[PDB]
Amino acid sequence: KLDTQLVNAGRSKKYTLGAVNSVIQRASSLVFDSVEAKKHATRNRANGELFYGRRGTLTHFSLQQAMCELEGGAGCVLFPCGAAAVANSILAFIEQGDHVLMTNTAYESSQDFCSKILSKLGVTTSWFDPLIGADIVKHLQPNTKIVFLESPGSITMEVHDVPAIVAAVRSVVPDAIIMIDNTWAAGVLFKALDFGIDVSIQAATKYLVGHSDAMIGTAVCNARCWEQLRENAYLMGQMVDADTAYITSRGLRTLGVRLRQHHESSLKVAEWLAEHPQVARVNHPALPGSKGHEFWKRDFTGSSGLFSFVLKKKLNNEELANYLDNFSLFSMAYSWGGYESLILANQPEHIAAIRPQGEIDFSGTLIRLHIGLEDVDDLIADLDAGFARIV
Amino acid sequence: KLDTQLVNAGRSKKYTLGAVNSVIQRASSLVFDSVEAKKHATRNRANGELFYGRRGTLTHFSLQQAMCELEGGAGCVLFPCGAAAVANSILAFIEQGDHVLMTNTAYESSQDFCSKILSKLGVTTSWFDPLIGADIVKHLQPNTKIVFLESPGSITMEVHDVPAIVAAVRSVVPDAIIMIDNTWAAGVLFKALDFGIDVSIQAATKYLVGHSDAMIGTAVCNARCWEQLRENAYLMGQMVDADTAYITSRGLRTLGVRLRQHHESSLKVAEWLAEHPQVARVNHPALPGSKGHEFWKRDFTGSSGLFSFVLKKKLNNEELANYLDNFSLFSMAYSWGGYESLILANQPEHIAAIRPQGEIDFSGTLIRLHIGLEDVDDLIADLDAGFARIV
Amino acid sequence: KKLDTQLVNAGRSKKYTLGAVNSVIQRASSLVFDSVEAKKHATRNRANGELFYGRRGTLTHFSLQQAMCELEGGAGCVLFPCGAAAVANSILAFIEQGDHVLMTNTAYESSQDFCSKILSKLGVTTSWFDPLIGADIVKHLQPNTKIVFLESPGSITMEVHDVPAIVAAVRSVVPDAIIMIDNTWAAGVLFKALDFGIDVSIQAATKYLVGHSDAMIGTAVCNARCWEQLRENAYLMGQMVDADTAYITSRGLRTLGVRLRQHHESSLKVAEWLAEHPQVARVNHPALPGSKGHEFWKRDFTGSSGLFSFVLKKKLNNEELANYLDNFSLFSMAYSWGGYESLILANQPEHIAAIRPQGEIDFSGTLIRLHIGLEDVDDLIADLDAGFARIV
Amino acid sequence: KKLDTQLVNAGRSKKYTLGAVNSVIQRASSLVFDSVEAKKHATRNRANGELFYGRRGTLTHFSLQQAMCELEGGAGCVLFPCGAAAVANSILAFIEQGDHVLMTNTAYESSQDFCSKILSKLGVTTSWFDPLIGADIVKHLQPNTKIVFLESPGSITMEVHDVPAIVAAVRSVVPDAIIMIDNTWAAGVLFKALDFGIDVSIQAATKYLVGHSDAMIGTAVCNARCWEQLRENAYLMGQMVDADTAYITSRGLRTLGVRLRQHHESSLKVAEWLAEHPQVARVNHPALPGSKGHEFWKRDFTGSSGLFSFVLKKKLNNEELANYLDNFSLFSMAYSWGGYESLILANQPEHIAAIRPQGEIDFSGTLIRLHIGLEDVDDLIADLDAGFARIV
């Protein structure tokens, strides 16, 4: 049923108004036809009636309903990008004197927000190894307010044991807000809310948009946490533009066909890399032997196309340029979840800089690949010519 | 020269690329053609080179340059709406233990952010009368970090004596960040940065967009404050979409012709209202006798079209509906700065609720009008039929 | 009925705005029918503003159409992907093999080229008339004349027709002619074409209606007589415009009054200064006394836009042309006009003679066409004066 | 040269992407010339991908054009505001009074109506041929035949032409005919029309290329022989598409492979189930053995899309039609197709007979046209089965 759900999510007649897709209603001012109507809108301003463009128009309401259907949420809060969704969802639940506990494989800008912004506000952050499972209880404090997960991890791809973590957290600090950056799974390949997580956050920028051309963050909330996240992010003025909301809704339509290709291609590339003379290790959650692969197999319903691998060699600057500068099909850029395949290098000392209170376990240059929609054998051919440049 | 500046601001060839207007470059991923190029982009990521869509594309850079030219700034920071610009510009400069001092006529969501969000983060806020001038020194504390102005004030339209306030603040707390919500002036009718203000904030949603169909906040900074505001708002993921940046740039083009009509019409309406049997008081900065009109005349180069007036009567609910429900040309909606004229009522007890540490001085129903681009005599006719419904 | 109030409200019915101030943007090809009964009703009303199929329009197009009918006083508004398509397709909609088309020799060049290169091979002939022919247009009418095509002011040279004289004269000889006008310069609104007994008023909405040089679109506002035939025959040619452009055209209407008043005030001040300037031979501005057809403009228009031309005393050689045009600071060279910025183009007398069929030109200096935008008028005059000093 | 890699990269030259992954969106009418020399160079290259005037395109259009030339193997790509405009205007670009047009009687109805209602009054005649005529097309050729217009598979009834036989036969009699095909169903890519000696491959990019039912646009990819004439004559009619739609069409290309593979796999599974169903008389799916021209599809196409039809054993009366169509849960009624969602439409045999000129129909039950979208195929089959139970 995921394919049927994606096609239809949010496409109620009150939003589509005779069209297949939702209307695009651009607005700040929304007009009240009478004092009575304005009183009704005001009462329902956070309940999907037209009130003011900062709260949404019909376009936003459509995306919101779609995201709640897909991720099994009580509400969906919108932001101008994923980093805004992370920073503001955390902010929405903290106060001076709180502790935040975050996986050390969190997205770097997520870590930065905590280390550079929260620290000045009387909020301390500490870190954990993504494979800690039930042993996370050692890191919990009486003042732990947020436990922030990201599975798989940024760059290095470690999958958490979310069931174990959640049961441990609920046993010790049941008031904690458990959040996950669920971007890799595009919210649909891991049903975070069904595992007891309070908030599922995505850079909708990535697979939901699908084409590398719009930025948008989403936070789907359970009933417990929706009101606080919604109202407190509203107080920070968080919203996304109507057109971007429309394009996000539109990305959902092809999300199933895209994610099946990303899975099929990326796993075939991971398998080929794993057997290559020049590769030390492959980090792909769907690949047997990868860190937390067992948790991927048990808890996810698919894979996307982002993964990494580690070269046997630590490339020097000359070698790095010869490798990365001469790809035919892979491009160097940040982000991912688009239709085109991307490549970035990360030296071991770079990654060690962004694993606080943890330790690196590789020594070669780490390559992160986003496997897009191009013919997989063409991509493999491009990677092999790559290896020949650095043998 | 303002008209020539508006027409040309930001329209460098590197952004327009053969067209009259800037290109619309939609992107998250921005591609690096080599390792050397990526190192160059990285070094210049906050200096107008293409790096990642969260920092901007050519479209954003164009708007940024335009806003810096118009408002005489070192940099322009972008946000998803005005309320986001206010909340995040304040957040960018505070830490636990700070004091914020804000005019009691600040926009209500500005006050709310301080009372509901900052309070939990160890930051206290207090308030001042907008006409306080040099006497503001009584409100300054050793830990005052931000002095937040809004001139004219929201709803009630009081104009500050900005020179007096700034000299007083610099004499007592020279480290304070002085910010102003300069939306009414559309940043161009009051050159805030030239008066020693550190940050000029706008709901670009209002007159810069001009058509009530896009939401966007801007903060133009002096050289002292730009880096901190830019980097700290980036850490909160603040940005606006490319298309909205384009539409903002595009609004600037007609801003002079619009604002001259808004001034001409709104002042003629204010003059007519001032002489009407049913009106107690008119609050329009351009109208002699209005609170701080002298400061308007000395410090501004024009007026926009938003003002208010107070009825002799405090309308009951029946009367409120008869009045507001039967307008032909005025519409009820929030926001303003568009092409169409708007009307809202505010009872005295409502306004008293949002003037902290201050006192109301009127007793009749307050009407706020946005005077748009319609024939002024048609608007006056609509207001007079209005008066006849409540005599 | 005051233009400014009309511009602000035109098309913004609740059924199209749906709670916002502007019309919604409804992007669609497919439009869904909830039942066979609904499908049947939509089919009947497919040319009557019911949702049927995106080629016929969505709510966004219907909004613009209503606005254009209101503003120009028409029974309907047909939409096209640019102004040239509106012209070409509006003429095509009414002709058949064996017809003749009578067109002002001041017509936009692409309109002339459509007649001479397309219509000719379809058995349709074209001839041309001087824009100041007036009542004497009777001399050019044939038994097979189907269309009389006006453009006032003229392209480039700005001659204003005596429309009342032309129209009364055509109707006295060929009452059932389709009279059309390319009314782009007046933005449909400074000259109410349909009130003068013209059947079809065509614009390049590309120009003033959009107002920012960033969208292309053509409109044809038609009387009740001609609406069905234009609409249906244009539809058979697949003519439509995208919903987003329709929205931006509706949105342009909102500032069209404040923009046109600035373009008039500035362009007339420029024109008056140019008339006095010793390097200028003549100024062609409808609003400036002495211009061809000024007295007709005075009588028949309720305002001016910002496009006009002037003729230099010199015929510039190539080196002087370059030195003049290449070094402007505020004026830019580009085609189109009707935007917020000022443009400049040169035309040599021999270039204009080549697009003035069956007629002669009336100047021998280099002609400069100006679009006066929204910049400070004294800055623009300073840029023009610096230009003069480069070709003394 | 693998389709998937081509789709991802087509048109994304650095000069159009300017640092991003997708082409920039350059909205413009005016395009600025920095000097007289630049203006002169832009003028020369105005049909060669230099910025000249928005009616000719911006960088965004040039990107799409390059992508379409690459994908269909053409020398150029002409753009139009919808598919119907592409058809109408591509035919117009090549005809003149006295010509004859030979068109498949399975042609999209609007294409037939253009010929019968527009072309007829311009001295151009049209006749029609059965889509399975093959080599016997020679029987319909006249000395004045200028165009032979193919559509394969056929609209609604889905008959596949033997294109190699038709084309060899036309060239043996009228070598200088312009042969065109409406190649919308194959999305330009499952049938490489230009490799079969067809001159012009036309699509309603509206359908599969856009892929989301929210933009309208037509394309005509032309060989070197025919490109200039199509381009220039289409331009004289003002044909263009907006930059934003061009961008969304380029963007549609990126997922066209993954979408078409799902539409094929799902629609064939549906077709196979329908063939077996006791309330179904026949299935018209190019990929299903037994369908008209299947063996030609097998030989000539590299895949299928998701549009096909089937004929019920019953001719539904009006009450049964309603009960059937009105109560679907996943299929929607709407025109167009090629999007992500599934659509259903009914056509009675007498309705199809009326749009099958110079030929007869081959069925007597109600015909149902299906577009199979991206929904779960077993959900769609369950909705169809519930439909069958409503008309047993």
Specify whether domain B1-254 bears CATH 3.40.50.1100: no
Specify the domain boundaries for CATH 3.90.1150.10 within chain D: 256-392
Note if the bond before B152 is cis, omega within 30 degrees.
yes
Specify the domain boundaries for CATH 3.90.1150.10 within chain A: 255-391
Nearest CA in chain B to D52: B18
Residues across chain B: 391
Nearest CA in chain A to D343: A20
B198 is catalytic: no
Nearest CA in chain D to B16: D26
Q: Tokens at residue C321, please?
A: 């042309």
Measure in Å the smallest separation between the Cα of C78 and chain A Cα atoms.
22
Q: Which of A13, A25, A30 sits opposite C24 (nearest CB)?
A: A25
Where does residue C32 rank: exposed (0-12), middle (13-18), buried (19+ CB within 10 A)?
buried
CB A270 within 8 A of CB A126: no
Phi and psi torsions of B24, nearest 5°: -105, 110
D19 interfacial to chain B (CB closer than 8 Å): yes
CATH number of this structure's domain D1-255, picked from the four choices 3.40.640.10, 3.90.480.20, 3.40.50.10090, 3.40.50.970: 3.40.640.10
B30 interfacial to chain D (CB closer than 8 Å): yes
Chains near B with 3+ CB pairs less than 8 A apart are A, C, D
Q: Per the residue annotation, which of C99, C130, C162, C182 is the catalytic one?
A: C182
Phi and psi torsions of A217, nearest 5°: -110, 150
At a CB cut-off of 8 Å and minimum separation 6, what does D68 contact? D10, D11, D74, D77, D188, D219, D221
Q: Which of B32, B112, B205 sits opposite A332 (nearest CB)?
A: B32
Q: For the domain bounded by D256-392, which CATH number is listed?
A: 3.90.1150.10
Positive or negative, the CA dihedral D325, D326, D329, D332 is positive
Q: CA D41, CA B352: separation in Å to the nearest integer?
A: 67
Residues in C touching A20 (Cβ below 8 Å): 28, 30, 32
Interchain contact, D237 vs C335, CB within 8 Å: no
Phi and psi torsions of A298, nearest 5°: -80, -35
Measure in Å the smallest separation between the Cα of B96 and chain A Cα atoms.
5
CB C66 within 8 A of CB C248: no
HEC assignment per residue over chain A: CHHHHHHHCCCCHHHHCCECCCCECCCCCEEECCHHHHHHHHHCCCCCCCCCCCCCCHHHHHHHHHHHHHHCCCEEEEECCHHHHHHHHHHHHCCCCCEEEEECCCCHHHHHHHHHHHHHHCCEEEEECCCCHHHHHHHCCCCEEEEEEECCCCCCCCCCCHHHHHHHHHHHCCCCEEEEECCCCCCCCCCHHHHCCCEEEEECCCCCCCCCCCCCEEEEECCCCHHHHHHHHHHCCCCCCHHHHHHHHHHHCCHHHHHHHHHHHHHHHHHHHHCCCCEEEEECCCCCCCCCHHHHHHHCCCCCCEEEEEECCCCCHHHHHHHHHCCCCCEEECCCCCCCCEEEEECHHHHHCCCCCCCCCCCCCEEEEECCCCCHHHHHHHHHHHHHHCC
Q: CA A157, CA B87: separation in Å to the nearest integer?
A: 35
Interchain contact, C212 vs B253, CB within 8 Å: yes
- Which position has the token pair 């199509």? D230
Residues in C touching A16 (Cβ below 8 Å): 32
Q: Tokens at residue B140, please?
A: 């300054």
The DSSP call for residue B295 is H
Interchain contact, D258 vs A210, CB within 8 Å: no
At a CB cut-off of 8 Å and minimum separation 6, what does B275 contact? none
Q: Tokens at residue D281, please?
A: 């008389």
Method for this entry:
X-ray
Measure in Å the smallest separation between the Cα of B20 and chain C Cα atoms.
7
CB atoms within 10 A of CB B10: 23
Nearest CA to A313 out of A276, A359, A358, A271 is that of A276
CB A218 within 8 A of CB A202: yes
B230 is catalytic: no
Nearest CA to A305 out of A357, A343, A362, A250 is that of A343
Q: Tokens at residue C141, please?
A: 């009418």
Specify the domain boundaries for CATH 3.40.640.10 within chain A: 1-254
Please give the class, per CATH, of domain B255-391: alpha beta
Q: Specify the 3-state DSSP secondary structure of B174.
A: coil
Nearest CA to A188 out of A210, A161, A166, A173 is that of A210
Nearest CA to B221 out of B79, B67, B10, B76 is that of B76
C contact residues 311-330, partner D, Cβ 8 Å cutoff: 318, 321-322, 325-326
For the residues of C32-100, what is the DSSP string, one character each? Answer: -BSSHHHHHHHHHTTTTTS---GGG--HHHHHHHHHHHHHHT-SEEEEESSHHHHHHHHHHHH--TT-E
Half-sphere exposure of C99 (CA within 13 A, CB side): 21
Residues across chain A: 391
Residues in B touching A29 (Cβ below 8 Å): 212, 331, 333-336, 338, 342
Count of C–D CB contacts within 8 Å? 211
Where does residue A169 rank: exposed (0-12), middle (13-18), buried (19+ CB within 10 A)?
buried
Nearest CA to D72 out of D208, D232, D175, D178 is that of D208
CB atoms within 10 A of CB D379: 17
A181 is catalytic: yes
Beta partners for residue C346, in sequence order: C368
Nearest CA in chain D to C90: D237
Interchain contact, C21 vs B258, CB within 8 Å: no
A54 is catalytic: yes
Note if the bond before A152 is cis, omega within 30 degrees.
yes
Report residue D344 CA to chain centroid gap.
19
Interchain contact, C214 vs D32, CB within 8 Å: no
The DSSP call for residue C222 is E
The DSSP call for residue C344 is E
Resolution (A): 1.7
Q: Specify the 3-state DSSP secondary structure of B6.
A: helix
CB B143 within 8 A of CB B168: no
Burial state string for B129-152 with b = 16 or more CB within 10 A and e = fewer than 16: bbbbbeebeebbeeebbbbbbbbb
Q: Which of C21, C22, C27 sits opposite A21 (nearest CB)?
A: C27
Interchain contact, C237 vs D85, CB within 8 Å: yes
Edge-to-edge strands of the sheet including D367-371?
D280-284, D307-312, D367-371, D343-347
Interchain contact, B19 vs D30, CB within 8 Å: yes
CB B76 within 8 A of CB B218: yes
Q: What would you report as the CA-atom Rg of chain A, rounded to the nearest whole angstrom?
A: 21
Nearest CA in chain B to A339: B29
Q: CA A81, CA A335: separation in Å to the nearest integer?
A: 12
Residues in B touching C262 (Cβ below 8 Å): 257
Q: CA C368, CA C313: separation in Å to the nearest integer?
A: 11
Residues in C touching A58 (Cβ below 8 Å): 18-19, 24
Q: Per the residue annotation, which of A98, A129, A161, A181 is the catalytic one?
A: A181
Nearest CA in chain C to D99: C122
Dmax over Cα atoms in chain D, in whole Å? 75
Residues in D touching B54 (Cβ below 8 Å): none
HEC assignment per residue over chain D: CCHHHHHHHCCCCHHHHCCECCCCECCCCCECECCHHHHHHHHHCCCCCCCCCHHHCCHHHHHHHHHHHHHHCCCEEEEECCHHHHHHHHHHHHCCCCCEEEEECCCCHHHHHHHHHHHHHHCCEEEEECCCCHHHHHHHCCCCEEEEEEECCCCCCCCCCCHHHHHHHHHHHCCCCEEEEECCCCCCCCCCHHHHCCCEEEEECCCCCCCCCCCCCEEEEECHHHHHHHHHHHHHCCCCCCHHHHHHHHHHHHHHHHHHHHHHHHHHHHHHHHHHCCCEEEEECCCCCCCCCHHHHHHHCCCCCCEEEEEECCCCCHHHHHHHHCCCCCCEECCCCCCCCCEEEEECHHHHHCCCCCCCCCCCCCEEEEECCCCCHHHHHHHHHHHHHCCC
Specify the domain boundaries for CATH 3.40.640.10 within chain C: 1-255
Half-sphere exposure of C362 (CA within 13 A, CB side): 15
Which of C182, C242, C247, C366 best tests the D interface by mutation, with the highest count of D CBs <10 A?
C242
Note if the bond before C153 is cis, omega within 30 degrees.
yes
CB B286 within 8 A of CB B293: yes
Report residue B291 CA to chain centroid gap.
19
CB C207 within 8 A of CB C187: yes
Mutual orientation of helices A226-235 and A82-93 as an angle, nearest 10°?
110
Residues in D touching C121 (Cβ below 8 Å): 96-97
Measure in Å the smallest separation between the Cα of C25 and chain D Cα atoms.
11
Q: Tokens at residue D374, please?
A: 């991206």
Q: Measure the N-to-C terminal CA separation of chain C; round to a whole number of Å.
A: 50
Measure in Å the smallest separation between the Cα of A146 and chain D Cα atoms.
36
